[PDB]
């Protein structure tokens, strides 16, 4: 996976066509001087612009894009799909792709939808048309077929940096995403900060247990780590002893990655009441 | 103040009469071998027993006591009254000492009463008879007079380690006690962990601001510090910069005391979801 955000703001791969099939080539960011976004407005490489023509998302749009009057287009990047975004699917009406429950909200975000469905004990949450939230446990949310991820790019009504599906198009998420806690026993998975992909709420204490029977060690990486405060903190505890193995906060970041020689770890997050930020994504991989 | 707990479990002063006036002298704990409590059952000085006859509370009774068939008695120790316990007062009925609101609860504790009143925006909370909670903003809760603190020693129905008043006797607390947050501007005050004097709840994030216009420094001491986990933590932040000045947790305790050369500090507490403990009491004293 090359993206651990919902809008691929963290994408830093080398796709430079709007689509791998039938796409247009991207312009170079160090020559797009007519346009708002180019390397001269953003020295220091902010949002990943540089001396290339690779798809990027520097302005908080819903997906990566590039300059190509249609002077820019979204890129359809298959590897850029955060873990837990299960895809964009067609919704032909009756029955719907998820059959559990639904609501509409003028402030819908991915997480407010996810959160609504999770509450009600549903496995899957789907957003359509920017404002409609569908929940379900149905395994066959793909019933009407997959759609290009670009057909799910309506802005969420509550957050314009986030995609919320489309007309007859539903963007699907596992409701574990951004839960405040959870048990993980898979060989490898990703854990997101609470409320992800919204910024994390103030005053959260959340922990997740990672227990992989038979592991000799577990490898941790933090492909996303955007925690604001010395007071916000992410901690890994030894599961058996509760000893704090590592403490990360806004002023002491994680190495690319590191290994813990345990089969049982507890990841804790504490959020203060000062400033919120995008949060984190931790990828763990157990090794036998 | 010689006690920062509600039952004086932390009292370590030298009173060895049950009362300073008309009292009986206490027996020595290193010769009370008939009794459950003595220095041979508790080597390592637990609950402050040693080679003395000083009032102590090693068994989680509601107040300090000593051996003197009435073979033991509570001690009436004027200095042992935690900051925010405003005293024990007479209640002669109509009108009551606090006139705001009331409830009864089979699980009453000091904090559940305090919490109920605070919620409703009352300054004062009072417990009577072990089970009755009274709230009020009335300044004259002392209207019927003070009583010996020993007349307020009914066990709280929800916590037998805590006093909850008596028949016609009300024990009074400032509702700031154990609040999850607050602003302090006094020259000196005490801040307690959340839910104090109950053990702190799991999953709390609380902060209190101490801002004393014109202070050159603020002196902090921790006369009580009973935090269980490496994962629970108390932190002091610079108010202007939010820099974490000191981090204390279950495995790294505070010095007797220390000074911060600021007029503006934020005290933060984070409580994990593993084990709770009695909590803390921080005494600050600003200096000009
Ligand atoms: C895409 O970028 C690569 C550099 O990674 C470059 O070799 C190639 O010229 C690019 N293709 C197009 C059409 O820009
Ligand atoms: C921008 O950078 C590319 C890749 O190095 C370079 O080939 C190109 O000529 C540059 N264009 C300008 C206007 O700097
Ligand atoms: C972590 O785990 C693997 C063994 O599975 C090891 O080969 C690799 O070098 C380790 N990485 C670090 C940073 O220790
Ligand atoms: C009280 O204890 C003090 C020691 O601090 C001792 O001098 C004195 O003998 C005691 N008085 C009584 C009656 O025990
Ligand atoms: C206990 O300690 C006191 C104070 O030191 C001492 O005077 C007394 O004789 C001791 N009694 C016994 C039985 O050890
Ligand atoms: C703290 O403050 C006072 C000045 O008000 C100073 O005299 C005292 O020595 C200080 N204590 C510590 C531990 O610095
Ligand atoms: Ca924060
Ligand atoms: Ca704890």
Chain centroid to CA A215: 27
Query: Over the Cα atoms of chain B, what is R_g?
Result: 20
Whole-angstrom distance, CA of residue A125 vs CA of residue A86: 10
Method: X-ray
> Phi, psi (5° rounding) for residue B270?
-130, 130
Q: What is the rounded end-to-end Cα distance, in angstroms, of chain A?
A: 22
Strand order in the sheet with B244-249: B182-184, B205-211, B264-270, B233-238, B244-249
- DSSP-derived pairing of the beta strands A264-270 and B72-74: unpaired
Give the separation between CA B168 and CA A214, rounded to whole angstroms: 63
Q: Residue B27 in contact with residue B38, Cβ under 8 Å?
A: no
CB pairs under 8 A between A and B: 48
Best to test chain A binding among B209, B230, B233, B235 (most A CBs inside 10 Å): B230
Quick one: which of B76, B75, B88, B61 has its CA closest to B7? B61
DSSP three-state, residue A166:
strand
Give the span between the Cα atoms of A242 and A235, in whole angstroms. 11
Q: CB within 8 A of B70, min separation 6: which ones?
A: none
Give A272→chain B minimum CA distance, Å: 7
3-state helix, strand, coil in chain B (%, to 5): 10, 35, 55
- The pair of structure tokens assigned to A6 is 């919902």
Q: Are B74 and B88 in contact (CB under 8 A)?
A: no
Locus of tokens 């990672």:
A210
Q: In what order do the strands lie in the sheet with B217-226?
A: B188-192, B279-287, B217-226, B257-260
- Whether A273 sits inside 8 A of B204 (CB atoms) is no
Rounded to whole angstroms, the Cα distance separating B16 from B53 reads: 6
Please provide the DSSP assignment of B105-119 as one string: -TT--HHHHHHHHHH
Which ligand neighbours the alpha carbon of A28 most closely? 2
- The response to whether residue A28 sits with its C-beta less than 6 Å from ligand 2 reads yes
CA of B221 to the centre of ligand 6 (A): 11
DSSP letter (8 states) at residue A206: E
Distance separating alpha carbons of residues A59 and A9, to the nearest angstrom: 8
Instruction: Identify the CATH class of B1-78.
Output: mainly beta
Residue A209 CA neighbour count, 13 Å, CB half: 11
Q: Check if the beta carbon of residue B273 is closer than 8 Å to that of residue B202.
A: yes
Contact B138, B123 (CB under 8 A): no
Resolution in A: 1.9
DSSP string, B213-224: TT-SEEEEEEEE
Nearest protein CA to atom 7 of ligand 2, as residue? A51
| CA gap A124, A6 in Å, rounded | 16
What are B6's strand-pairing partners?
none
Write out chain B residues lying below 8 Å of A205, CB-based.
202-205, 270-273
Rounded to 5 degrees, φ, ψ at B118 are: -55, -45
Query: B230 CA distance to ligand 8 centroid (A)?
Result: 8
Contact status, residue B56 vs residue B63, Cβ threshold 8 Å? no
Domain ranges for chain A: 1-78, 79-178, 179-288
């Amino acid at each position: 996976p090359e993206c651990f955000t919902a809008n691929g703001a963290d994408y830093r791969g080398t796709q430079n066509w709007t689509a791998l099939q039938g796409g247009k080539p991207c312009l170079f960011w160090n020559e797009t001087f007519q346009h708002p976004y180019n390397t001269l407005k953003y020295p220091n490489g902010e949002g990943g612009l540089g001396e290339h023509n690779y798809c990027r998302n520097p302005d908080g749009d819903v997906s990566p894009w590039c300059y190509v009057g249609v002077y820019w287009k979204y890129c359809e990047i298959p590897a850029c799909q955060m873990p837990g975004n299960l895809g964009c699917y067609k919704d032909h009406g009756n029955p719907p792709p998820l059959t559990g429950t639904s609501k509409t909200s003028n402030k819908l975000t991915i997480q407010t939808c996810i959160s609504f469905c999770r509450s009600q004990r549903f496995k899957f949450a789907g957003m359509e048309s920017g404002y409609a939230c569908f929940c379900g446990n149905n395994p066959d949310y793909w019933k009407y077929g997959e759609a290009a991820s670009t057909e799910c790019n309506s802005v969420c009504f509550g957050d314009h940096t986030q995609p919320c599906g489309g007309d007859g198009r539903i963007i699907l998420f596992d409701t574990l995403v951004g839960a405040c806690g959870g048990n993980y026993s898979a060989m490898s998975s990703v854990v997101y900060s609470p409320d992800f992909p919204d910024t994390y709420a103030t005053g959260r204490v959340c922990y997740w247990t990672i227990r992989v029977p038979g592991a000799s060690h577990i490898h941790f990486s933090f492909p996303l780590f955007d925690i604001r405060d010395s007071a916000d903190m992410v901690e890994l505890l030894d599961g058996y002893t509760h000893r704090v193995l590592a403490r990360f906060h806004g002023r002491s970041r994680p190495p690319l990655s590191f290994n813990v020689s345990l089969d049982f770890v507890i990841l804790y997050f504490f959020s203060d009441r000062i400033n919120q930020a995008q949060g984190f994504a931790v990828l763990y991989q157990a090794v036998k």
